[PDB]
Design a protein around this ligand. Structure first.
Ligand SMILES: [Cl-]
Ligand SMILES: [Cl-]
Ligand SMILES: [Cl-]
Ligand SMILES: [Mg+2]
Ligand SMILES: [Mg+2]
Ligand code: NA
Length: 214
Protein backbone atom coordinates (compact mmCIF):
# COMPACT_ATOMS: atom_id res chain seq x y z
CA UNK A 1 0.00 0.00 0.00
CA UNK A 2 1.24 3.49 -0.87
CA UNK A 3 -0.04 5.98 1.70
CA UNK A 4 0.39 9.70 2.25
CA UNK A 5 -0.21 10.73 5.88
CA UNK A 6 -0.83 14.44 6.44
CA UNK A 7 -1.46 16.31 9.65
CA UNK A 8 -0.98 19.62 11.37
CA UNK A 9 2.08 20.14 13.60
CA UNK A 10 1.17 18.83 17.04
CA UNK A 11 -1.87 16.80 16.01
CA UNK A 12 -0.08 13.48 16.63
CA UNK A 13 -0.38 11.67 13.29
CA UNK A 14 2.76 9.78 14.27
CA UNK A 15 0.69 7.81 16.77
CA UNK A 16 -0.60 5.66 13.91
CA UNK A 17 2.64 5.20 11.97
CA UNK A 18 3.78 1.92 13.50
CA UNK A 19 0.32 0.44 13.09
CA UNK A 20 0.44 1.20 9.35
CA UNK A 21 4.01 -0.02 8.95
CA UNK A 22 3.18 -3.36 10.57
CA UNK A 23 -0.16 -3.79 8.79
CA UNK A 24 1.45 -3.59 5.36
CA UNK A 25 5.16 -4.25 5.79
CA UNK A 26 6.19 -0.82 4.58
CA UNK A 27 8.70 1.79 5.76
CA UNK A 28 7.91 5.26 6.96
CA UNK A 29 9.60 7.83 4.71
CA UNK A 30 9.90 11.59 4.91
CA UNK A 31 11.60 14.39 3.02
CA UNK A 32 13.53 15.23 6.16
CA UNK A 33 14.91 11.71 6.50
CA UNK A 34 15.65 11.56 2.76
CA UNK A 35 17.79 14.67 2.81
CA UNK A 36 19.81 13.36 5.74
CA UNK A 37 20.24 9.92 4.15
CA UNK A 38 21.12 10.82 0.55
CA UNK A 39 23.91 13.06 1.87
CA UNK A 40 25.45 10.07 3.65
CA UNK A 41 25.18 7.90 0.54
CA UNK A 42 27.42 9.94 -1.74
CA UNK A 43 24.90 9.56 -4.55
CA UNK A 44 24.67 12.45 -7.00
CA UNK A 45 21.29 13.64 -5.73
CA UNK A 46 22.69 13.56 -2.22
CA UNK A 47 25.61 15.71 -3.27
CA UNK A 48 23.29 18.17 -4.97
CA UNK A 49 21.14 18.25 -1.83
CA UNK A 50 24.18 18.64 0.44
CA UNK A 51 25.39 21.64 -1.59
CA UNK A 52 21.98 23.32 -1.34
CA UNK A 53 21.73 22.74 2.42
CA UNK A 54 25.30 23.85 3.10
CA UNK A 55 24.50 27.14 1.36
CA UNK A 56 21.51 27.61 3.69
CA UNK A 57 19.29 27.52 0.61
CA UNK A 58 15.87 26.05 0.03
CA UNK A 59 15.55 22.59 -1.44
CA UNK A 60 13.61 23.01 -4.68
CA UNK A 61 10.52 20.97 -5.37
CA UNK A 62 12.42 19.49 -8.31
CA UNK A 63 15.14 18.11 -6.02
CA UNK A 64 12.73 16.91 -3.36
CA UNK A 65 10.69 14.99 -5.92
CA UNK A 66 13.79 13.39 -7.40
CA UNK A 67 14.74 12.29 -3.88
CA UNK A 68 11.25 10.83 -3.30
CA UNK A 69 11.45 8.99 -6.63
CA UNK A 70 14.85 7.61 -5.67
CA UNK A 71 13.71 6.63 -2.15
CA UNK A 72 10.68 4.62 -3.33
CA UNK A 73 12.77 2.73 -5.87
CA UNK A 74 14.75 1.18 -3.03
CA UNK A 75 14.11 -2.43 -2.18
CA UNK A 76 12.38 -1.70 1.10
CA UNK A 77 9.49 0.06 -0.65
CA UNK A 78 8.49 -3.07 -2.56
CA UNK A 79 5.25 -3.48 -0.61
CA UNK A 80 4.59 0.28 -0.58
CA UNK A 81 5.51 3.11 1.71
CA UNK A 82 4.12 5.50 4.29
CA UNK A 83 5.04 8.98 3.08
CA UNK A 84 4.89 11.17 6.18
CA UNK A 85 4.09 14.84 5.86
CA UNK A 86 4.64 15.37 2.12
CA UNK A 87 3.50 16.83 -0.22
CA UNK A 88 2.90 20.11 1.54
CA UNK A 89 1.66 22.23 -1.40
CA UNK A 90 -0.26 21.78 -4.66
CA UNK A 91 2.91 22.48 -6.74
CA UNK A 92 4.57 19.55 -4.93
CA UNK A 93 1.59 17.25 -5.50
CA UNK A 94 1.59 18.20 -9.19
CA UNK A 95 5.32 17.47 -9.39
CA UNK A 96 4.53 14.04 -7.93
CA UNK A 97 2.03 13.50 -10.73
CA UNK A 98 4.46 14.75 -13.40
CA UNK A 99 7.00 12.26 -12.08
CA UNK A 100 4.57 9.35 -12.00
CA UNK A 101 4.24 8.98 -8.23
CA UNK A 102 0.66 8.01 -7.40
CA UNK A 103 -0.51 6.67 -4.05
CA UNK A 104 -3.39 4.51 -2.93
CA UNK A 105 -4.54 6.52 0.06
CA UNK A 106 -4.23 10.09 1.31
CA UNK A 107 -5.08 10.22 5.03
CA UNK A 108 -5.75 13.60 6.70
CA UNK A 109 -5.15 13.23 10.46
CA UNK A 110 -7.45 15.93 11.82
CA UNK A 111 -7.34 17.48 15.30
CA UNK A 112 -8.94 20.90 15.91
CA UNK A 113 -6.48 23.72 16.52
CA UNK A 114 -7.75 24.38 20.03
CA UNK A 115 -7.06 20.79 21.07
CA UNK A 116 -3.56 20.92 19.62
CA UNK A 117 -2.86 24.08 21.56
CA UNK A 118 -4.23 22.64 24.79
CA UNK A 119 -2.03 19.56 24.35
CA UNK A 120 1.22 21.45 23.76
CA UNK A 121 0.95 24.32 26.25
CA UNK A 122 0.35 21.84 29.08
CA UNK A 123 3.80 20.32 28.58
CA UNK A 124 6.48 20.84 31.24
CA UNK A 125 10.15 19.90 31.09
CA UNK A 126 13.17 19.45 33.32
CA UNK A 127 15.63 20.82 30.78
CA UNK A 128 18.92 19.47 32.27
CA UNK A 129 17.63 15.89 31.78
CA UNK A 130 14.97 16.11 29.09
CA UNK A 131 12.40 14.62 31.47
CA UNK A 132 8.91 15.62 30.36
CA UNK A 133 5.60 16.09 32.17
CA UNK A 134 2.12 17.34 31.30
CA UNK A 135 -0.37 19.11 33.56
CA UNK A 136 -3.24 16.95 32.32
CA UNK A 137 -1.75 13.66 31.07
CA UNK A 138 1.46 12.96 33.04
CA UNK A 139 1.72 15.40 35.93
CA UNK A 140 4.70 15.34 38.31
CA UNK A 141 4.56 14.20 41.91
CA UNK A 142 5.09 17.61 43.51
CA UNK A 143 3.36 20.46 41.69
CA UNK A 144 5.63 22.20 39.19
CA UNK A 145 8.79 20.36 40.30
CA UNK A 146 10.92 17.62 38.74
CA UNK A 147 10.40 14.25 40.47
CA UNK A 148 14.11 13.45 40.57
CA UNK A 149 15.90 16.70 41.47
CA UNK A 150 13.06 18.79 42.89
CA UNK A 151 13.97 21.62 40.53
CA UNK A 152 11.15 23.76 39.17
CA UNK A 153 9.94 22.69 35.73
CA UNK A 154 9.95 24.91 32.66
CA UNK A 155 8.33 25.08 29.23
CA UNK A 156 10.02 24.95 25.84
CA UNK A 157 10.21 28.13 23.80
CA UNK A 158 9.03 25.88 20.95
CA UNK A 159 5.80 25.32 22.91
CA UNK A 160 4.71 28.90 23.65
CA UNK A 161 1.06 29.44 22.74
CA UNK A 162 1.64 32.34 20.36
CA UNK A 163 4.26 30.23 18.55
CA UNK A 164 2.02 27.16 18.30
CA UNK A 165 -0.91 29.19 17.02
CA UNK A 166 1.24 30.95 14.41
CA UNK A 167 2.50 27.59 13.17
CA UNK A 168 -1.07 26.28 12.85
CA UNK A 169 -2.27 29.38 11.01
CA UNK A 170 0.55 28.96 8.50
CA UNK A 171 -0.10 25.23 8.20
CA UNK A 172 -3.77 25.58 7.34
CA UNK A 173 -3.23 28.37 4.80
CA UNK A 174 -0.80 26.08 2.95
CA UNK A 175 -2.67 22.81 3.38
CA UNK A 176 -6.32 23.73 2.71
CA UNK A 177 -5.81 23.83 -1.09
CA UNK A 178 -3.86 20.56 -0.89
CA UNK A 179 -6.74 18.83 0.89
CA UNK A 180 -9.11 20.03 -1.81
CA UNK A 181 -6.63 18.80 -4.42
CA UNK A 182 -6.65 15.26 -3.07
CA UNK A 183 -10.42 15.21 -2.54
CA UNK A 184 -10.74 16.02 -6.26
CA UNK A 185 -8.18 13.36 -7.13
CA UNK A 186 -10.31 10.86 -5.23
CA UNK A 187 -13.46 12.00 -7.06
CA UNK A 188 -11.57 11.30 -10.30
CA UNK A 189 -10.66 7.82 -9.08
CA UNK A 190 -6.92 8.43 -8.99
CA UNK A 191 -6.52 7.82 -5.26
CA UNK A 192 -8.60 7.50 -2.14
CA UNK A 193 -8.87 10.25 0.41
CA UNK A 194 -10.09 10.09 4.00
CA UNK A 195 -10.30 12.62 6.81
CA UNK A 196 -9.35 10.80 10.00
CA UNK A 197 -10.71 11.95 13.35
CA UNK A 198 -7.54 12.09 15.40
CA UNK A 199 -9.40 13.15 18.57
CA UNK A 200 -10.53 9.60 19.40
CA UNK A 201 -8.50 7.14 21.51
CA UNK A 202 -5.54 5.61 19.69
CA UNK A 203 -7.22 2.21 19.64
CA UNK A 204 -10.38 3.67 18.11
CA UNK A 205 -8.46 5.59 15.44
CA UNK A 206 -6.68 2.34 14.64
CA UNK A 207 -10.00 0.56 14.18
CA UNK A 208 -11.24 3.43 12.01
CA UNK A 209 -8.15 3.20 9.82
CA UNK A 210 -8.68 -0.53 9.46
CA UNK A 211 -12.11 0.20 7.95
CA UNK A 212 -10.76 2.98 5.73
CA UNK A 213 -7.91 0.87 4.38
CA UNK A 214 -9.29 -2.67 4.65
CL1 LIG B 1 2.61 15.94 15.61
CL1 LIG C 1 13.09 8.27 4.20
CL1 LIG D 1 10.40 10.46 42.96
MG1 LIG E 1 14.61 4.55 6.36
MG1 LIG F 1 -9.44 21.38 8.38
NA1 NA G 1 5.16 5.63 -12.60
Amino acid sequence: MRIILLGAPGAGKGTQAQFIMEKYGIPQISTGDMLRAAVKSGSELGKQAKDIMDAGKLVTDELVIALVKERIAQEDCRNGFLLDGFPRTIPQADAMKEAGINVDYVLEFDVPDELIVDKIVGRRVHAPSGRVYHVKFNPPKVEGKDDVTGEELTTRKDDQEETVRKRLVEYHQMTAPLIGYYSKEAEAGNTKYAKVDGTKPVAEVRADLEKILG
